[PDB]
Amino acid sequence: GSHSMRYFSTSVSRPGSGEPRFIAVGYVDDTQFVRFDSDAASQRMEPRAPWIEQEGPEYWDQETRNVKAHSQTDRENLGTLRGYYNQSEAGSHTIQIMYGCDVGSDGRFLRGYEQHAYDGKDYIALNEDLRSWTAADMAAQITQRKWEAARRAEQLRAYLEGTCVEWLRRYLENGKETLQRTDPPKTHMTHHPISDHEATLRCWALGFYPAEITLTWQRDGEDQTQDTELVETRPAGDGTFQKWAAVVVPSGEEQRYTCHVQHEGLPKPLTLRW
Amino acid sequence: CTELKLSDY
Amino acid sequence: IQRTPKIQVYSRHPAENGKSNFLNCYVSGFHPSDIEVDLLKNGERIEKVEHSDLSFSKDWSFYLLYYTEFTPTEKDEYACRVNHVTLSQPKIVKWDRDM
């Protein structure tokens, strides 16, 4: 069981005032644990999981200072990118950043990330080697050259391989009773006649954690993809997730169509039919 | 916990 | 630049008439981030609707969960309404207990 920590941030310019909207969220695996919203009254990092509440005032002060600094960097960068791309002040633009790290079962570093987007498209990202950058265009390469000259990668790598992993380990221990759980999917099939020729089968997976799951159909033992539908995995709102997969079949031939459910919380995959 | 700071583009 | 929202409207637990539950509208895959999401009861906006904090997927598109406590009945019709710059008119998706 590997684990991840991720911070997601979004700054959106507001031409009418000049103060961007900044929203940052932190996750361990599929569980959110902190948020910051510049529109909120607190102007501080806020807890969103019970196991972060035990952190003292020094944690909240430092996290708030850091995230506010991040918001200010984004604010300056919105202006810089307007310059690089020759855009006017009239339109709203967006900077998004995702960063964080993965650890293995032994709690040791696996992978690190820092990826940036402008207006929903790649801008610049740290490569997997944590020593080089991928710029999407020549504007982003201005940034790349700046970060190369400043040796930013070595500083970021220290965070990703050090601070990020050690704090992920702390959170996993402090929240172990919920973060290190697996909730297996509860499964069932529904069935809806369409016509004298056709019927719908819908295979359900409910109440599972983490969110990763695979639902597949087979017809007479071979994977079936034609005439199928798969919805995005969705949050139930209580920390667990849901998903369904459907297939249109000849009426009366439902016995040929098996749904297969794979999830980390299942000892072996489940198969089910109407 | 967060990065101490990000960087200017 | 712009991406239209995907919409799923559904309950937290299997719906049973007379049993308290949560009604959810999960919007995803949209850009830019400004969006209006409402839960409707018999065509009227429900007043106490909360939502998750804005986050995004690998492709940079945003997602949000809007939710409210509710007790389903036989007669009451529920729906999710979404407005966004990509939409020529608001999109209304009705709640179907098996969707």
Author numbering:
A (entry chain A): 1 to 274
B (entry chain C): 1 to 9
C (entry chain B): 1 to 99
What do the study's own words say?
The major histocompatibility complex (MHC), also known as the human leukocyte antigen (HLA) system in humans, plays a pivotal role in activating T-cell immune responses by presenting antigen peptides on antigen-presenting cells (APCs). HLA-A*30:01 and HLA-A*30:03 differ from one another only by five amino acids, three of which are located in the PBG. In this study, we determined the peptide presentation features of HLA-A*30:01 and HLA-A*30:03 through a series of structural and functional investigations. To explore the structural basis of the different peptide-binding characteristics of HLA-A*30:01 and HLA-A*30:03, we determined the structures of HLA-A*30:01/RT313, HLA-A*30:03/RT313, HLA-A*30:03/NP44, and HLA-A*30:03/MTB at 1.5, 2, 1.4, and 1.6 Å, respectively.
In contrast, NP44 could bind HLA-A*30:03 but not HLA-A*30:01 in vitro. We also found that NP44, which was an A1 supertype allele, HLA-A*01:01-restricted peptide, could also be presented by HLA-A*30:03, but not by HLA-A*30:01 (17). Furthermore, in the structure of HLA-A*30:03/NP44, additional water molecules can help the PΩ-Tyr of peptide NP44 bind to Asp74 and Asn77 in an α helix, to enable stable peptide binding, quite similar as in the structure of HLA-A*01:01/ NP44. Alignment analysis of NP44 presented by HLA-A*01:01 and HLA-A*30:03 showed a similar overall conformation of the presented peptides in the PBGs of the two alleles. However, the side chain of P3-Glu, P5-Lys, and P7-Ser point to different orientations in HLA-A*01:01/NP44 and HLA-A*30:03/NP44, respectively. Further analysis revealed that Arg152 of HLA-A*30:03 formed a salt bridge with P3-Glu. However, no hydrogen bond was seen between Leu156 and P7-Ser in HLA-A*30:03. Even though the PΩ-Tyr side chain of NP44 could form a hydrogen bond with both the positively charged His116 in HLA-A*30:03 and the negatively charged Asp116 in HLA-A*01:01, the hydrogen bond networks of residue 114, 116, and the PΩ-Tyr of NP44 were different. In HLA-A*30:03, the negatively charged Glu114 could form a salt bridge with the positively charged His116 and Arg152. Mutant HLA-A*30:03N77D lost the ability to bind with NP44, whereas HLA-A*30:01D77N bound NP44 with high capacity.
